Amino acid sequence: RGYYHGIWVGE
Amino acid sequence: EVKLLLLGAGESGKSTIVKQMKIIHEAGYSEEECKQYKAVVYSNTIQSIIAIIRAMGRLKIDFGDSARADDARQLFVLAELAGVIKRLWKDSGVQACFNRSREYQLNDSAAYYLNDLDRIAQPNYIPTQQDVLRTRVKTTGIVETHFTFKDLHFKMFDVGGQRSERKKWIHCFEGVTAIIFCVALSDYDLVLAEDEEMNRMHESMKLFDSICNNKWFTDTSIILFLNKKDLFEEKIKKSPLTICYPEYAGSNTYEEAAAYIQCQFEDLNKRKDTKEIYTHFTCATDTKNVQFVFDAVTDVIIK
């Protein structure tokens, strides 16, 4: 968890 | 034709680099253009001085002169106000809390504008180009921009980096020729405003990693701007890197650190083999840099 579609967005 | 995309985390310089793509490859900013920024200038300048104030009332710091406590009571009122600010800008005191900016959130231009106030209070002031480059406005959802250079048509996409925005990036992921990832070098000791508990260069690394290495970008040119070198190069002279990287064993010098860092980033390439990264050291605000570099850059893409 943390990621959005390969993309790191944060927990 | 050419899809360019600019990425990065928040406040990394992206939108400034867009600004130059424009001064460079077009005419740049007019007077009537300059003028609509007047008002940002002023906004920025106020909120910055205020946040320092405010900040002192938490860090408990004390103006140089007792006298300045009216000037402060009266900054808020309010919002002759330049006078106030000037005057405060220069309290020994306030300048200590400004040298501590990283215990808080202050904009980056905060000193550029403050330090130049006589010049931009005088009414009938018109922003310059740097004045304009140095401004802040949060980019959200995404902005497209066109231009031709060397005989390509660039289609340039400009996003926001706070996390809250990263959400909407995927809609720009197809068809991408090049990316420019921006990193603020001077972030090595700051924490994220979306999250005080995160180092900002840490968060940047994460992200880079996640782009560098994303499956949409496999035939995309990854270009990395490390940026704010101006600012880095000063910081580094009194805050130490070990703060980001507690295992750095070098000395703290622009030279040595910039490179450690150049490095920590370049190593998050998981295909060092298949995929190259094309890295530049930048000052988005410097027009002459950027233009230089972005030549470099394009003659790469040409591939």
Ligand SMILES: Nc1nc2c(ncn2[C@@H]2O[C@H](COP(=O)(O)OP(=O)(O)O)[C@@H](O)[C@H]2O)c(=O)[nH]1
């Ligand atoms: N000194 C300096 N200031 C910069 C540089 N890049 C950006 N800034 C200032 O940093 C702020 C934010 O960059 P910004 O353009 O807003 O990028 P965005 O955050 O990514 O949309 C603006 O105030 C810029 O003027 C730089 O290289 N050097």
Ligand code: ALF
């Ligand atoms: F990266 Al945002 F404003 F900080 F574009």
Ligand SMILES: [Mg+2]
């Ligand atoms: Mg922006």
